[PDB]
Structures are given as structure tokens and as C-alpha cells.
Write a protein that binds this ligand. Structure first.
Ligand SMILES: Nc1ncnc2c1ncn2[C@@H]1O[C@H](COP(=O)(O)OC(=O)c2ccc(Cl)cc2)[C@@H](O)[C@H]1O
Length: 501
């Protein structure tokens, strides 16, 4: 295997004086050799203060060069970094760190978090990021330390992933997973080894794409990672131009923003250097996709992936955001909902997408053996997504099993109806739910008007009748709301909505 550490180490022997980290706004640049020096120095410092291999360290910070240095230093030492979304409420962060039995916590968020950690009773030692490394410059004492022995199945990193109503679960990523979590960027997306690589770090580092597929890949291929501390669509495009960015990996929401800024900019922004525009994470509307093809350069690639197994499907120059096919490393099937991994459907029938659990796969959720046994079954990872094989030999993603509505013997996927209701005049936001009906469930739309506008059930039903929706799919009730209840990561508390209505 090559661990994260070993991929970056080899890269540094190959391209020591090439730029590894660029932070344009701050005028900071570090070569592969310089980044290595600082990784080693922060590692030694942590080891002198008593941090040891296989111990877990929570990391809670926005993207920055300093956090890259810190995360890589923890790994270099042998400790297991547990990367956490900084938008999580203090209390949820304090509880996850606690449940994880973590030796320490590296944070670059408020005093309020720091309190909440201390005030929770977990033994985790609080480390402020700017106390470890500041603007690429470490506070250094001790140097240097032993490169610890790493084993294929051994835990390497922990990433968090939301469940059928949280808290987020701690997915344990083993040492052997790193290589294939990088190399799909080459086999599926077509990135290749070389100092030509300038990768815009738009994805957050607490997400497996932000870290393996963007940061680690950028470096492991002897390229440059461009740090983005806060997403700004025009600024980001200026960086593409200034830095000669070759690839960018973003969410449907980033790309919608970028496509529009690019449309407005025209030939004012030179985007020639950009060869790869990759997206994953959500199912992108057709309208967003179309503007992507229209106003952004480079090859477009849709990537289906999970925290648990990384990349399982993809599509080059996609026409819809729903249809993708397995690539290298991957093996997939669609099986009856709630059935065995060998219960294959008559393709064209709907079932659960499951993918083989091989080298890229997590080894389990930390301290949740029951959730693990639901997800990892007989060599397979179960995605909890509903899918169908198209007559074209592709996998159409339909929606979450958990979101699926069962109304009079039929699967009804809210995402499909939300897609249609989204295009109705005056609708700013819509979530579609099943309300308990003693037939099984009744399809219900919850709709928010655009600022100052009015909506009506009559008008929205008419609109649905004029749509391509199958009759049985049209909502039976509408609720016009001024807000949908959401968590701190702004996703709909669908169960709590059901309650609210
Ligand atoms: N291109 C895509 N289209 C539709 N759904 C997609 C998608 N990529 C991921 N998803 C779904 O979003 C969920 C978001 O889960 P998360 O745990 O937030 O992580 C990801 O998005 C993700 C995407 C790609 C890779 Cl290689 C690794 C991780 C995921 O579990 C899938 O069920």
C-alpha cells in the first residue's frame, strides 16, 4: 500500500522545490520540501507534548494551510485525525469528541466550542490551531521523531457522515483505502501525475472528497493545492485564471454560482487552463447542469460517492445528474429493498444500490456496531440509495431509501416531485413528505414562497397537472410555509417537518 503519508513523502522526493501549497490572498507559498519540513516539525512538537500513534485527535477548522499542515502532522505522527464540520453546533461537536474517546482536539473555531468541550466531561486536550502552526510557520521544539509502522487494516482517519436522523456517525477509514481514494481521480476523472497539476481546494477538508480526492491527490500527483478560505464565485474564477488551475471539484451549488458568474464575466475571465470540472455529493438539477456545460470550460464529470466507500459510479459529459456507471475499483448491484445482497432485481425494477466493500471501504463506524452491521453485509456496503438500471446500461439514482414514500403500493421519490415543484412560479423552496395515512402514506408538499409572493394549493396542483408527473405522484395536500426546519448543516429535519404539519 501507499498510505497518505507515503504518497506525500514520495512526491516530496520527486518534486522537492515545486509549489505544494499556495495561499494567494495571504501571499503564502510552500514547496513540497518546505511543507514536509513543517509537517515533521509540527509532528515532533505534538510528540514532545505526549501524543502517540493510534490515539484519536479531533480537528475542527475552516480550510487553511495551517490545518493542512496540522492534519498531515497528526497522520505523520501516527495519530488518527477525526475531521469535523465547523458548522456543527458546539454541543454536537463536544458530544462527538466525547463518544469518540479522543486524546485531544485541534480547533480554529470560537471560545464557545472550547468551553463546551471542557464543560462536557470528555478527557480531550484542547489545542488551538494557531498555537501549533500560524501562517505556515510552526512553533517548533524537540525534532525529529520515528516514522511509525502502519498496517493496511489499521485506522488512518475518521470522517463523519449523517444517519437516519443523526448524530453523524464516525466512519473509520483504514490505511489501505487512501490509494484508491486518490487514484479514482486519475482512472475516472483523468487527472495524471505531474507538476502541471493546479487543484483549486474548493471542497472542505472535513469531507472525504475535500481531503483524499482534492488535497491528497493534488500533492500525491506532485502538483499544487490552492487553498480557498471562503467561497466567492468571481474570486474563485480569478484564481482559476491567476493560478492557472487545471482542475476543480465542487458541489452543484458552487457550480451553479460559478457558471452564472462566468456567464456574466464572458471573455473578461480567461478559464483556458481549466481541464477538469468535477462534481459529486448531491444530485444536480438539469438546469444547473446545462449552464455548467454552457458557461464553464473543461471536461465535466459526475461522481457518485460515499464517505464509506468513496467512488462507485461516474459519468463523463453528463446529460442528467442522475445517471452514472461503475468505474475502476468498483463493483455494484441493485438489490430488493431490505433483502439480501444476492437478491438482484429484474433491471428496470427499483431496489437498493450496494457496492462491494474492498480496499477503499471504511472498516466500521466507531462505537456503533449495530449501524455497522446494517451497512456492511457479506462483503458489500449498502448505500441506502434507491436506484434503477436504465435500458442504456446505466444506474439511475432515484433518492434515499429513507426519503421514499410508499403510497398505495408505490414507491414515490420526493426528489422527483421537488424537482418539478421547484420550477413553479413563486416557489423558493420545497420539500415533499409522506404523511401517515391509515393508504400507508399520502404525498404532501411543503412549499416556501419567494420573498413577498403568495402561493396557493389550487395553483400548485394545476401546475403539477400540467407537468410530466404521473397522476399517482401529484401531492394530495400542500402546506405553504415561511421556513423549513433545518439543522446547523442546513438540511431539512424531515421527521420534525412531519410533526410540525
Ligand atoms: N453525484 C451524485 N449524485 C447524486 N447523489 C450523490 C452523488 N454523490 C454522492 N451522492 C449521495 O450523496 C450522499 C452524500 O454523502 P456524504 O457522506 O455527505 O459524502 C458525499 O457526497 C461523497 C460524494 C462522492 C465521494 Cl467519491 C465520496 C463522498 C452520498 O451518501 C450519496 O448517497
Amino acid at each position: 500500500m501507499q498510505t497518505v503519508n507515503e504518497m506525500l513523502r514520495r512526491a516530496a522526493t520527486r518534486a522537492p522545490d515545486h509549489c505544494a501549497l499556495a495561499v494567494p490572498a495571504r501571499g503564502l507559498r510552500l514547496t513540497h520540501a518546505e511543507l514536509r519540513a513543517r509537517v515533521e516539525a509540527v509532528a515532533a512538537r505534538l510528540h514532545a507534548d505526549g501524543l502517540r500513534p493510534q490515539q484519536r485527535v479531533a480537528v475542527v477548522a475552516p480550510n487553511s494551510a495551517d490545518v493542512v499542515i496540522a492534519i498531515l502532522a497528526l497522520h505523520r505522527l501516527g495519530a488518527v485525525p477525526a475531521l469535523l464540520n465547523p458548522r456543527l453546533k458546539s454541543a454536537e461537536l463536544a458530544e462527538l469528541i466525547k463518544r469518540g474517546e479522543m486524546t485531544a482536539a485541534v480547533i480554529a473555531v470560537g471560545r464557545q466550542v472550547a468551553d463546551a468541550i471542557f464543560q462536557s466531561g470528555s478527557g480531550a486536550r484542547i489545542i488551538f490551531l494557531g498555537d501549533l502552526v500560524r501562517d505556515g510557520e510552526p512553533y517548533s521544539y524537540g525534532p525529529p521523531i520515528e516514522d511509525p509502522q502502519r498496517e493496511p487494516a489499521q485506522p488512518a482517519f475518521i470522517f463523519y457522515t449523517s444517519g437516519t436522523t443523526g448524530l453523524p456517525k464516525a466512519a473509520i477509514i483504514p490505511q489501505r483505502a487512501a490509494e484508491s481514494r486518490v487514484l479514482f481521480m486519475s482512472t475516472q476523472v483523468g487527472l495524471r501525475h505531474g507538476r502541471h497539476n493546479v487543484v483549486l481546494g474548493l471542497m472542505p477538508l472535513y469531507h472525504v472528497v475535500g481531503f483524499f480526492a482534492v488535497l491528497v491527490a493534488a500533492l500525491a500527483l506532485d502538483g499544487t493545492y490552492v487553498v480557498i478560505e471562503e467561497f466567492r464565485p468571481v474570486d474563485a474564477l480569478q484564481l482559476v485564471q491567476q493560478e492557472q488551475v487545471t482542475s476543480l471539484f465542487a458541489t452543484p451549488t458552487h457550480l451553479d454560482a460559478l457558471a452564472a458568474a462566468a456567464a456574466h464575466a464572458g471573455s473578461s475571465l480567461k478559464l483556458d487552463s481549466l481541464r477538469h470540472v468535477t462534481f459529486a455529493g448531491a444530485t444536480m438539477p438539469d438546469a444547473v447542469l446545462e449552464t455548467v456545460h454552457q458557461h464553464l470550460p473543461g471536461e465535466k464529470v459526475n461522481i457518485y460517492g460515499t464517505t464509506e466507500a468513496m467512488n462507485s459510479l461516474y459519468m463523463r459529459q453528463p446529460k442528467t445528474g442522475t445517471e452514472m456507471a461503475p468505474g475502476f475499483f468498483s463493483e455494484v448491484r441493485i438489490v430488493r429493498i431490505g433483502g439480501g445482497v444476492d437478491e438482484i432485481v429484474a433491471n428496470g425494477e427499483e431496489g437498493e444500490l450496494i457496492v462491494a466493500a474492498s480496499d477503499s471501504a471504511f472498516v466500521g463506524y466507531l462505537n456503533q456496531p449495530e449501524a455497522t452491521a446494517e451497512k456492511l453485509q457479506d462483503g458489500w456496503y449498502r448505500t441506502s440509495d434507491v436506484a434503477v438500471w436504465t435500458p442504456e446500461g446505466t444506474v439511475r439514482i432515484l433518492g434515499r431509501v429513507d426519503d421514499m414514500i410508499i403510497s398505495g403500493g408505490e414507491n414515490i421519490h420526493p426528489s422527483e416531485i421537488e424537482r418539478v415543484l421547484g420550477t413553479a412560479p413563486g416557489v423558493t423552496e420545497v420539500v415533499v413528505i409522506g404523511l401517515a395515512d391509515q393508504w400507508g402514506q399520502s404525498v404532501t408538499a411543503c412549499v416556501v414562497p419567494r420573498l413577498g409572493e403568495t402561493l396557493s394549493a389550487d395553483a400548485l396542483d394545476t401546475f403539477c397537472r400540467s407537468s410530466e408527473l404521473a397522476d399517482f405522484k401529484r401531492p394530495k395536500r400542500y402546506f405553504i410555509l415561511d421556513q423549513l426546519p433545518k439543522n446547523a448543516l442546513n438540511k431539512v429535519l424531515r421527521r420534525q417537518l412531519v410533526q410540525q404539519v
